Amino acid sequence: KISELRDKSLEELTQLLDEKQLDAFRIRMAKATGQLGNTHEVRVNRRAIAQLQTLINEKQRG
Amino acid sequence: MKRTFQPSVIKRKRTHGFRARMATKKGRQVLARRRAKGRHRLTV
Amino acid sequence: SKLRKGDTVIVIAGKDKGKQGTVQAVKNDRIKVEGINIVTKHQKPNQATGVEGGILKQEAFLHISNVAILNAQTQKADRITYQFGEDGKKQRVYRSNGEVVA
Amino acid sequence: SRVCQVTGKRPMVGNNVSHANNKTRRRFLPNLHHHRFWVESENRFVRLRISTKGMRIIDKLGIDKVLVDLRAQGQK
Amino acid sequence: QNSASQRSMVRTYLKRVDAAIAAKDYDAATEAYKKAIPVLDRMADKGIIHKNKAARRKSRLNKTI
Amino acid sequence: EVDENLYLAARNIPHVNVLDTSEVDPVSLIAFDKVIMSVEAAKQFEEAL
Amino acid sequence: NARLYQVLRGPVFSEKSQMLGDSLGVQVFKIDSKATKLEVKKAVELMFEGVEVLKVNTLNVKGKTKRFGKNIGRRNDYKKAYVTLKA
RNA sequence: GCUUCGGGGAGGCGGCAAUAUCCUGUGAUCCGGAGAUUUCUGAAUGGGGAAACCCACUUACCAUAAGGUAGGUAUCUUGAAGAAGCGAACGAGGGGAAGUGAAACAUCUCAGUACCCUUAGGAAAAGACAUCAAAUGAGAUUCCCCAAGUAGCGGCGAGCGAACGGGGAGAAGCCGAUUAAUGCUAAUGUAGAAGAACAGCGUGGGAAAGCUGACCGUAGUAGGUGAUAGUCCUGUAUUCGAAACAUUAGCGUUAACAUAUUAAGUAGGGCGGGACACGAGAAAUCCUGUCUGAAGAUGGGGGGACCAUCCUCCAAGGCUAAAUACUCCUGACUGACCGAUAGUGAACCAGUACCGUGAGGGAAAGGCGAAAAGAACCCCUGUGAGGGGAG
């Protein structure tokens, strides 16, 4: 997945990151209510947000 | 019996404060001794 | 560490010496082999747990050194060595016959 | 402090010695005095806390020489 | 005893190198010195012989060569 | 003199040890049951002692 | 916009919360400790469409001290808010 | 916990401590190099403060609301760059006790020790003769063994205690023997890889021990494995790898600083002290608080009061590696060192519990079994505790 994240250019990374933030909010709400069946999705989503932030930072730096 | 100890956090903090210890050079030595000993609670 | 999951092994020590079974799993220094070193197990029925419970017969981990890989051709326990090919691919090799298998 | 700028004299330590040869710690203080030295090169009086030996050094070497020495030394 | 034998083996090689120096033949000295080097490096790890001493011997032998 | 090959052969053996004539100890001589020693080494022991 | 998502940690389920929701139609959300009433209002409006907040109330609760085994520990402090909504 | 670069090849998501969802040959977990993120307090440095808190100003941008994003705003020194604070021992310097001994005690000793303060570097200091010697003279400094508990000092009591010189370690003399980077060459370190050889029989819960007979050895007294293994495992001998970064040396180059030209308030002297093994003593030599004060090579210093002769050397400018001192630490190795009242206070969730306002004081506490195989199930009992059966 990291190659897919890397290939895409910065401006769309920002929008993808915002979408990921919304998804994480929804996942937290579903976890709080107990609707969420599987708990791996939240961890993988958090790792994805971290990867996106790192890629944005590298592209901004150079 | 007003016994020896009568707690007041304001006076305790002024007299044994971390900032009060830093203000005087000697008190920094006391804090450094606590750190060297390894005590978890440096100051009240 | 040389031994890996999914290959037949022969145990040369203990009560079950002389019995050959496939290795279910390895952790760090202990190995578990199906049909070898079976130990009686007592399980307390819990309704929260799905498992029924009761007396069960299951494998017990044993030390890796006791078990040895079994060579198919000679049907005897053999030591394992690593041989490096020109291509660079690494494969386990039986010490006795230089056999390519395992 | 009680230190001569020109020559760096400062309090010395020593012993008061009694006739019975009892020793007690004592200090020897420099003969420090406030003096306004006239300087023609700047047409002004400069006030120094100076020792008697310092004033003699002013007399022998010149206020200009001593003043440039102080400025090189630092505080002016 | 074992350490003494380890020490003993080196001295013969160093004596041979000294004889090579006396001969003044480049290759004969070079082969003997290169033969000795690793054994001295190995003994250095054990601590029987000082590392500074080994380095001084190596520098002296290189200068002689 | 002690050659590297003779040293490497000797060291592994349980109770066989090799030492140069100059570096010889009484504890070793007493301890090890039998002693193998050359005539030239013997001459150098005569000169040493 | 990113901060508004983080403001709200989730809902609060309790008998008092259920009674408040039934009686007055007021929701109860866990929030970040540093988040303020204005941020809570903006986050609620953003997260839920068609809801307008009359007023926001925020309070801080210390975590309880719970003993397990040989060690002494305290629960992490949490902040919760009461959000009123249009009827 | 993220990215990247290497190693590795089958398990893994740290421990008590398991469970669940899952990841992993599209190379996971794990190891090594580098990078990114790095809340608040703390030198804390925008102001303040009862540390982990309160309040701000301002530049730019964004929003239209009551805000967000990225910065800047302490003090001092030098003319934008530095410094501040913390942390073992060793070094140098500024101050500097008393218990004690003298069978009392004041000189003296303890001792320039404890302690306080300041400040460096891997060492520091010192270092080239205005030094000794008086021998046929030697030739800086530092450290070790003698000289020697000698010569001396000493209410000549208690005690203190050299030097000349000999033998060694190491050696060096200079006026740029300085600092800090950058760039090449070589080496090292920071993950790793391969790595020999045992079978039968009996006893035994289990074999590594016993009997018999083999094999490897540049690997045979290593740690484990159900009892004691060179040949079961990890290992050992031996040979070895580096994308990346550090460190060491050699070379090249840069920019910061320094670069004396022979030495006057200096040598010497009076008074009062201090250091010299030396306590004013016949007291040489060194330092200076005070007052004084030359010669300046046709001169001056020393050679233990002092004079003469003789010998030696040129103070009032600076620098200089080695041999020497130490261990908060890193790697390897070792021990007629200890083995849970021992060994660090701390083998264990220890500078913890506990004690005190505080400075500060300061514990106790290890072991089932080879493997949980940690006792399903039944019975008495209160669904407790505990136990008897079964296993």
Tab-separated table of N, CA and C (backbone and C1' of nucleotides) in Angstrom, chain C residues 17, chain H residues 199-203 207-212:
chain	number	residue	atom	x	y	z
C	17	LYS	N	10.016	-42.275	22.167
C	17	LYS	CA	11.123	-42.432	21.237
C	17	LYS	C	10.783	-43.497	20.201
H	199	A	P	23.808	-41.558	15.157
H	199	A	O5'	23.056	-42.959	15.229
H	199	A	C5'	23.023	-43.706	16.438
H	199	A	C4'	23.515	-45.118	16.237
H	199	A	C3'	22.962	-46.157	17.200
H	199	A	O3'	21.670	-46.619	16.845
H	199	A	C1'	25.299	-46.393	17.079
H	200	G	P	20.630	-47.064	17.987
H	200	G	O5'	21.163	-48.489	18.460
H	200	G	C5'	21.230	-49.578	17.551
H	200	G	C4'	21.883	-50.787	18.174
H	200	G	C3'	21.330	-51.226	19.521
H	200	G	O3'	20.145	-51.996	19.408
H	200	G	C1'	23.687	-51.167	19.625
H	201	C	P	19.012	-51.911	20.545
H	201	C	O5'	19.669	-52.643	21.799
H	201	C	C5'	20.018	-54.019	21.737
H	201	C	C4'	20.769	-54.463	22.967
H	201	C	C3'	20.095	-54.179	24.299
H	201	C	O3'	19.098	-55.130	24.629
H	201	C	C1'	22.361	-53.523	24.413
H	202	G	P	17.793	-54.681	25.450
H	202	G	O5'	18.322	-54.484	26.939
H	202	G	C5'	18.687	-55.600	27.737
H	202	G	C4'	19.195	-55.169	29.089
H	202	G	C3'	18.309	-54.198	29.853
H	202	G	O3'	17.257	-54.849	30.545
H	202	G	C1'	20.551	-53.439	29.905
H	203	U	P	16.002	-54.006	31.090
H	203	U	O5'	16.642	-53.016	32.161
H	203	U	C5'	17.090	-53.497	33.419
H	203	U	C4'	17.612	-52.380	34.284
H	203	U	C3'	16.668	-51.212	34.491
H	203	U	O3'	15.662	-51.473	35.453
H	203	U	C1'	18.827	-50.397	33.995
H	207	A	P	15.725	-41.792	27.441
H	207	A	O5'	17.121	-41.499	28.150
H	207	A	C5'	17.608	-40.167	28.269
H	207	A	C4'	19.110	-40.122	28.425
H	207	A	C3'	19.912	-40.860	27.352
H	207	A	O3'	21.117	-40.141	27.085
H	207	A	C1'	20.456	-41.731	29.469
H	208	A	P	22.049	-40.534	25.838
H	208	A	O5'	23.529	-40.437	26.423
H	208	A	C5'	24.457	-39.468	25.943
H	208	A	C4'	25.200	-38.795	27.073
H	208	A	C3'	25.242	-39.579	28.383
H	208	A	O3'	26.467	-39.311	29.068
H	208	A	C1'	24.142	-37.521	28.736
H	209	A	P	27.735	-40.280	28.874
H	209	A	O5'	27.830	-41.074	30.251
H	209	A	C5'	28.310	-40.445	31.430
H	209	A	C4'	27.843	-41.177	32.663
H	209	A	C3'	28.091	-42.680	32.673
H	209	A	O3'	29.401	-43.025	33.091
H	209	A	C1'	25.842	-42.268	33.224
H	210	G	P	30.250	-44.107	32.263
H	210	G	O5'	29.485	-45.479	32.527
H	210	G	C5'	29.429	-46.045	33.829
H	210	G	C4'	28.843	-47.435	33.799
H	210	G	C3'	29.377	-48.351	32.707
H	210	G	O3'	30.594	-48.975	33.077
H	210	G	C1'	27.010	-48.447	32.739
H	211	C	P	31.751	-49.215	31.992
H	211	C	O5'	31.189	-50.403	31.093
H	211	C	C5'	31.001	-51.702	31.634
H	211	C	C4'	30.508	-52.666	30.585
H	211	C	C3'	31.223	-52.603	29.245
H	211	C	O3'	32.440	-53.329	29.230
H	211	C	C1'	28.893	-52.581	28.885
H	212	U	P	33.587	-52.950	28.171
H	212	U	O5'	32.891	-53.177	26.757
H	212	U	C5'	32.516	-54.479	26.335
H	212	U	C4'	31.899	-54.461	24.959
H	212	U	C3'	32.672	-53.699	23.899
H	212	U	O3'	33.761	-54.444	23.379
H	212	U	C1'	30.370	-53.151	23.756
